[PDB]
Structure formats: structure tokens, C-alpha cells
């Protein structure tokens, strides 16, 4: 999956943005947390599409956000 | 410490809010994690004041957030 350009993203509907961002976020999350990638991707997609798009272009910040999501999920079990 | 009312909180400066919310968050976090309470309270105080205030009146979600912060600190190792 080639990256989405900012021009493309603003030319898409809200639901098209979600599918394109979700697909590309899922692949990156799957490399870190393959089993929980669907749920963590769903958690990311609640953010504004500009913030979700930033994660695709900042691997350090994506990895931090995956850790944050796992910790939210771990705390939810308690 | 006595609790803050929402009317008081909205009438305080940002630094007045942080000190009032911090002192109260610290006491509650200290009962759960007395050693890491300064660090965890500092992590909490990066929230918006309305979000941090909601933790003071929701003990169950406060405990969840302490667990979350401990998890983040552990992953930082």
C-alpha cells in the first residue's frame, strides 16, 4: 500500500478517509501487535483524521501510541 | 482537602487549577502508588483541567488511569 498524499486525503469522503487510513494503520500496528491490531486500529480511528495520518508518517509516535493503546486495554481488564 | 466545585475551578487561573487539582490528585494516587505518586500525578496534570477534575469524582476510573500510567512507565523500561 503506497502512502496517501495530503491532497488525496482532503479529496476523500469521511468514510473513504477512514478505510484508507485504517488499512494503512492496520498494517503498521500488525507488525507490533498482530493479535490486537483490529482493536488498536479501531481505537486510533477515533482520533481526528489529521492525527491518524500523522501516525503513518512518524514511526516513533505510532509505536508510542500502540504502547498507550495496549496500556489502556490492560487497565480496562483491571 | 475539601473538594473543588466546578464553579471554583472555572474561576481559577491555569496555574491555580494545576496546584489545586494536583494536590488532590496526589493524595488519591498516593493511596494506590505512594512511591510513584509524584510521577503519576505529573502525568495526569497534562490532561485538560475538566478531564483531570473528572478523575477526582470517579474513583473507579481514577484507579484505572493509575494502572494505565504504571503500564506506560513499565513499558518505558
Amino acid at each position: 500500500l503506497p502512502p496517501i498524499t495530503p491532497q488525496e486525503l482532503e479529496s476523500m469522503s469521511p468514510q473513504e478517509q477512514r478505510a484508507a487510513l485504517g488499512d494503512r494503520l492496520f498494517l503498521k500496528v500488525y507488525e507490533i501487535a498482530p493479535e490486537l491490531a483490529p482493536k488498536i486500529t479501531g481505537m486510533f480511528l477515533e482520533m481526528k483524521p489529521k492525527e491518524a495520518y500523522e501516525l503513518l508518517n512518524d514511526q516513533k509516535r505510532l509505536e508510542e501510541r500502540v504502547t498507550e493503546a495496549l496500556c489502556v486495554l490492560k487497565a480496562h481488564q483491571t | 482537602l475539601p473538594p473543588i466545585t466546578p464553579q471554583e475551578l472555572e474561576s481559577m487561573s491555569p496555574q491555580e487549577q494545576r496546584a489545586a487539582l494536583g494536590d488532590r490528585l496526589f493524595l488519591k494516587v498516593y493511596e494506590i502508588a505512594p512511591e510513584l505518586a509524584p510521577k503519576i500525578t505529573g502525568m495526569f496534570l497534562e490532561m485538560k483541567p475538566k478531564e483531570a477534575y473528572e478523575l477526582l469524582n470517579d474513583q473507579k476510573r481514577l484507579e484505572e488511569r493509575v494502572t494505565e500510567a504504571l503500564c506506560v512507565l513499565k513499558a518505558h523500561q
Binding site: E68 | D23, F26, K39, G42, M43, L45, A69, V72, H76
Partner: peptide, 12 residues
């Protein structure tokens, strides 16, 4: 969403 392990400690 904020849970920053580098945050400054709060001392009362």
C-alpha cells in the same frame, strides 16, 4: 490522549 512517561513530577 496523554500518558507521557517523561512528564514532570508533581510535588505538593
Amino acid at each position: 490522549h496523554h500518558m507521557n512517561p517523561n512528564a514532570t513530577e508533581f510535588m505538593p
